[PDB]
Amino acid sequence: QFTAVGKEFNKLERRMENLNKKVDDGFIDIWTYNAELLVLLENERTLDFHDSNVKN
Amino acid sequence: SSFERFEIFPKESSWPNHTTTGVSASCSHNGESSFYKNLLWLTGKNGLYPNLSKSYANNKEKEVLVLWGVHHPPNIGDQRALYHKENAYVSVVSSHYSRKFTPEIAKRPKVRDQEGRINYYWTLLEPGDTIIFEANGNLIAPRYAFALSRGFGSGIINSNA
Amino acid sequence: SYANNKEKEVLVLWGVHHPPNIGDQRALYHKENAYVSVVSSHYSRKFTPEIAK
Numbered sequence: 001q002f003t004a005v006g007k008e009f010n011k012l013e014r015r016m017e018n019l020n021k022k023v024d025d026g027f028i029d030i031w032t033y034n035a036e037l038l039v040l041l042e043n044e045r046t047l048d049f050h051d052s053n054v055k056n
Numbered sequence: 057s058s059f060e061r062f063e064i065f066p067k068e069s070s071w072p073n074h075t076t077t078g079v080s081a082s083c084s085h086n087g088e089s090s091f092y093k094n095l096l097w098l099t100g101k102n103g104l105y106p107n108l109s110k111s112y113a114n115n116k117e118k119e120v121l122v123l124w125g126v127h128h129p130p131n132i133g134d135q136r137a138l139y140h141k142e143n144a145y146v147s148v149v150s151s152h153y154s155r156k157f158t159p160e161i162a163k164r165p166k167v168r169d170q171e172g173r174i175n176y177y178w179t180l181l182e183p184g185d186t187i188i189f190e191a192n193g194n195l196i197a198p199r200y201a202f203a204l205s206r207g208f209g210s211g212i213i214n215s216n217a
Numbered sequence: 218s219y220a221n222n223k224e225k226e227v228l229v230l231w232g233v234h235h236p237p238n239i240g241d242q243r244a245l246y247h248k249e250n251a252y253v254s255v256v257s258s259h260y261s262r263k264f265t266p267e268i269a270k
């Protein structure tokens with residue numbers, strides 16, 4: 001969906017800034033880990049798929 | 057989604073007992089002293105600052121953004137010369153906004169060759185709502201309000217592209 | 218007044234005292250109604266003593 005992932009906080013709202021930073025970093029961590037693991041596993045699956053086609 | 061810069065207080069009619077020609081050196085245009093275009097600096101006319109009282113009722117079927125300000129003279133002499141009263145107030149009364157501002161006079165570090173700051177406040181007025189401005193000094197009154205309809209909540213980008 | 222020149226942020230603490238009874242305020246500060254104004258470029262507040270048992 002349409003989103004803007006950037007927010008601005010003043011100098012008396014650092015708890016909010018750290019909460020937003022935690023949200024952003026957690027989303028980045030989840031997406032990075034999932035994307036890398038997914039790419040590795042699907043590369044293995046694709047190579048096995050081609051191997052199975054040749055053997056069949 | 058739709059932005060309209062309109063007159064909330066036309067300078068011609070609205071203020072008959074105030075000079076409303078105040079200009080600032082820091083806000084300079086083409087070498088001449090100037091001020092903001094959406095706000096007007098009020099000052100005592102004929103040596104008096106009469107008790108102000110203004111009301112605006114929203115009828116635009118849209119949200120109205122209103123800006124104003126409060127002036128803090130650097131020394132008590134500036135306040136005496138400008139508004140002729142040592143202690144003043146600014147009351148902004150809405151159905152969901154309500155505040156009183158009191159000038160705080162203090163010697164402050166010089167920025168843009170000025171000694172006393174002015175604070176800027178804003179509010180959003182719902183359709184069918186009324187906002188009341190009252191004061192006897194230090195009011196930087198609104199000139200143009202902004203009727204707007206909020207759209208997808210986006211943000212801003214700091215860039216040189 | 219204090220002007221910051223440390224090339225660093227300066228944390229400043231202070232307090233406002235509320236005497237329990239009006240007698241304590243009279244004995245201490247000799248005035249029934251007082252105030253504390255703290256004025257900064259981005260901080261500005263006025264504090265008024267609230268005397269209560």
Ligand SMILES: *[C@@H]1O[C@H](CO)[C@@H](O)[C@H](O)[C@H]1NC(C)=O
Nearest residue numbers: 070071072073106107108109
């Ligand atoms: C200006 O002063 C006159 C009386 O001298 C008064 O009737 C009028 O309401 C005042 N206008 C404003 C905007 O305060």
